[PDB]
Every structure is written in C-alpha cells, then in structure tokens.
C-alpha cells in the first residue's frame, strides 16, 4: 500500500543521500522498480537533480525514523512507489 | 579555525537543507558572509545548485553533530566561507 505518492512543492530529506547519475531523470525511476531498498525519489517537472540537472536524480532513503529535514520552494515533486517504502521500518 | 576552503567532487551537507534563486552562482556565497547563518554552500564551477541550475544557490546548515552525509564523484563542491563556521557544532 503505497504505489504511487508524490507530494509536491516539498521534499523530506531523509538519511542517505546521493546524486544518481542517470538517463533521462524520469527512467531513473527503474532503481526502484529493480532494487527495492529505496525512498524518496526527488525530481522536477524538469530536470532531477534538485532543481536543474538533465542526467541525474535525487535520491535518498529514511532507514532510522530520523526528523524528515524539509527543503521548501525551489523544488517540484518527490515521490516513493512500489514495495520498497516498506524499508522504511524494516 | 575557518578559512575559505572548497573540497570538490564531494559534498558533505548535515541537517537543514535549503535552495534559492539568485544570478550570479558564486556571487551567492557572499549571502553568507552578510547573513549569518548558513555554514556550508554548494556549488560547482559550471552552474552550481547541487551540480546544475544556473541561477540557483544551495546551502545547508548543521548545527548539532548530526551524521554527515556524503556526496562522491558527483563533482559537487561545497565551501567554508569564514566566521559562521563556528556554529558547525554550537
């Protein structure tokens, strides 16, 4: 029970994050849909990495219950989809 | 104590995360030295915002020894500015 949610105009910066070097910022996705052991997945309507970058994607999962840090703003949507979500609390 | 120092390829951001728009890329660490508190900014050489963005400053604070996340090989510098530095673990 998570499928698809993206929350927009936010993103909650979880634990352990890094910059995916990918191709076309919306494939990126597939990292998902392959190895089930991430979480948020943050992109624009255009580009991924934050805000601009064409090849890449901001992706970071929460494996402690860590204070989700919230970035505000310049930002476009962030979503975790599949099974993988579940990671979260082990 | 803090000098301007600019590590590259590597990112280390903390706690707080936060984006904003403003032209001139490198012009954008100068926000720091006249609003004090923001600790480390990220930047590259090309567009700066994470990797790419043109027109977008990104920096994130840490105030508490908080566990560092790490960015690599995805060419992201961030810099210490001067005086603000201290805060890194007040």
């Given at each position: 029970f998570c499928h698809s949610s993206f929350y927009h105009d936010t993103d909650f910066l979880g634990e352990e994050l890094d910059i995916v070097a990918a191709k076309s910022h919306e494939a990126c996705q597939k990292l998902c849909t392959n190895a089930v052991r991430c979480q948020f997945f943050t992109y624009t309507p255009a580009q991924a990495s934050c805000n601009e970058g064409k090849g890449k994607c901001y992706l970071k999962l929460s494996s402690?219950?860590?204070?989700?840090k919230i970035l505000h703003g310049r930002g476009g949507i962030s979503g975790y989809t599949l099974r993988l979500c579940k990671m979260d609390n082990e």
């Open positions: 402690n219950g860590s204070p989700t």
